[PDB]
Write a protein that binds this ligand. Structure first.
Ligand SMILES: Cc1nsc(N2CCCNCC2)n1
Length: 211
């Protein structure tokens, strides 16, 4: 086992194959411990979950400081934090996976390159190299800074995202809100008048598929 796994791929290879909460260590530094939810079953496992929507219990209409720091119950609905995502995606070449489920239908998207810049970039999104069944709805968002109501699409749709003008992905939108562009949307799967019941965003090293 590795003593200070830097992501859920190094925790999984540590022989932990059950999804749930694991300690990772940013940059493999024992003083930078982070409790994360690892999805160890989807397409080979090793995924740090960084967003989960499933029941509308948690408030995602939160401010910059909340989106930078993270919030919620990592076993239920939560947001991992932009500072965490920047530090994890700085460690190597990561891939993004999005898992969606709505009334028993599933879809997914994978982006072979995924990074989040630091605060001086307003947590700039990089997403490239799409495959999947959900439709490439993140391409619209590529290169955009993050937006909250206090740093306006976040205000107009009462969510937070790497907004443009405004969104094809709104997975931090209002739960169960089927009003146009208000809900948990993935446009190229279910459009802007269908709020998706279940959504996860997760990351792992892009090379994990052949390591
Ligand atoms: C289909 C799939 N996605 S990742 C994965 N493995 C992780 C790396 C260890 N060896 C292979 C198992 N399998």
């Amino acid at each position: 086992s590795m003593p200070f796994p830097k992501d859920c791929s190094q925790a999984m290879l540590n022989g932990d194959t059950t999804s749930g909460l694991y300690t990772i260590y940013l940059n493999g530094d024992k003083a930078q411990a982070l409790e994360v939810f690892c999805d160890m079953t989807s397409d080979g496992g090793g995924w740090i979950v960084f967003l989960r929507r499933k029941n509308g219990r948690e408030n995602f209409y939160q401010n910059w400081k909340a989106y930078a720091a993270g919030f919620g119950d990592r076993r239920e609905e939560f947001w991992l934090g932009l500072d965490n995502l920047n530090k994890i995606t700085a460690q190597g070449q990561y891939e993004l996976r999005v898992d969606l489920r709505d009334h028993g239908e599933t879809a997914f998207a994978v982006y072979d390159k995924f990074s989040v810049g630091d605060a001086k970039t307003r947590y700039k999104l990089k997403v490239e190299g799409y495959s999947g069944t959900a439709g490439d709805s993140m391409a619209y968002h590529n290169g955009r800074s993050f937006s909250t109501f206090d740093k306006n699409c976040a205000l107009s749709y009462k969510g937070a995202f790497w907004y443009r003008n405004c969104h094809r992905v709104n997975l931090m939108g209002r739960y169960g809100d089927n009003n146009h562009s208000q809900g948990v949307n993935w446009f190229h799967w279910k459009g802007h008048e269908h709020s998706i019941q279940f959504a996860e965003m997760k990351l792992r090293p892009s090379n994990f598929r052949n390591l």
